[PDB]
Design a protein around this ligand. Structure first.
Ligand SMILES: [Cl-]
Ligand SMILES: [Cl-]
Ligand SMILES: [Cl-]
Ligand SMILES: [Cl-]
Ligand SMILES: [Cl-]
Ligand SMILES: [Cl-]
Ligand SMILES: [Zn+2]
Ligand SMILES: [Zn+2]
Lengths: 189, 189
């Protein structure tokens, strides 16, 4: 399990990649599964911020088959433009390795299915101040769509572990930029 | 693809069972997957009852691995006796074939993922008057625990299709009893 694995349209998962170990994650009203270290840190984060009553886990692990059904549904209902913006191609979603969480607001209702609401909120603001201290980064920041190939998603967080999440967050980097940085650095040696 | 397949502790899924066709199902606050005919009928039922803003799909298709992790989670959090009452053994859950739905109310926060709240509500009462007309039965009725081996679950519905759901519901039967009836009736010929 490499917590730093880069998964995107240019770096799809391999077909022979071993499914992640999984556990059911707490703090949701439905069954959501994550890699065990991810679930542990999610739980630690929610408890430490006192956000139990204000936020909830919306999505976690999803198989390739499921990612394809999600892509196909969004294509049919919302069209290609929206779908390309907010839904990773099957085989190219970090949800498939159990390292990604989609988080939503609790008193929030009438949610978008693909884009849960996690904006304009004191709870979200507190979450954004602490999540990096528990190994999470905001995966798809607002002005990075050319780098990530995905639109702004304030609800989507990727587990990379410490100190990576703190380094990435402090520099306002994407995971793509973090990989570029590590590659540029090793060569110096 | 028998919509009548009996899956329980005494009749676990085959190891050689075809995994089901799947589509994303509407009327949830997260991604849920079901066999296509079940999703279609679920949607028709919610629209017919006008419950789009009142009820939600809590759970649908669950892989065997996920059922194991759900079972393991409940053991840890709720203990063995409670887990055996409300969670099917891994390999013995109709959720694994995409023909079962767990239904809850939309305006609930901190709902229980094991036992979603689905009683004492106008929406639930209306759902209970119409679901049999769209192919669904209440899988685990009260006072059938000795027959089904599972405690009463007002939130859990099984798709069997028409007219079976109407026949089962009118007789206040379980799917177990329906199977015994079909077998006994075949013998009369
Ligand atoms: Cl697992
Ligand atoms: Cl699957
Ligand atoms: Cl996605
Ligand atoms: Cl039986
Ligand atoms: Cl399919
Ligand atoms: Cl179950
Ligand atoms: Zn996501
Ligand atoms: Zn269920």
């Amino acid at each position: 399990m490499n917590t730093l694995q880069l998964i995107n349209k240019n770096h799809p998962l391999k077909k022979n990649q071993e499914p992640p170990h999984l556990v059911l994650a707490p703090f949701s009203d439905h069954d959501v599964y994550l890699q065990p270290e991810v679930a542990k840190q999610w739980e630690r984060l929610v408890r430490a911020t006192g956000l139990e009553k204000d936020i909830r886990l919306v999505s976690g692990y999803r198989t390739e088959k499921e990612q394809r059904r999600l892509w196909e549904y969004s294509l049919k209902e919302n069209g290609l433009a929206y779908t390309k913006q907010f839904v990773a191609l099957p085989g190219c979603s970090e949800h498939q390795i159990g390292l990604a969480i989609d988080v939503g607001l609790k008193k929030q209702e009438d949610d978008d299915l693909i884009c849960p609401h996690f904006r304009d909120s004191a709870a979200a603001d507190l979450f954004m101040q602490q999540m990096m201290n528990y190994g999470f980064i905001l995966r798809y920041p607002e002005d990075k769509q050319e780098i990530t190939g995905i639109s702004y998603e304030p609800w989507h967080f990727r587990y990379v572990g410490l100190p990576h999440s703190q380094v990435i967050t402090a520099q306002k980097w994407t995971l793509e930029e973090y990989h570029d940085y590590l590659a540029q650095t090793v060569r110096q040696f």
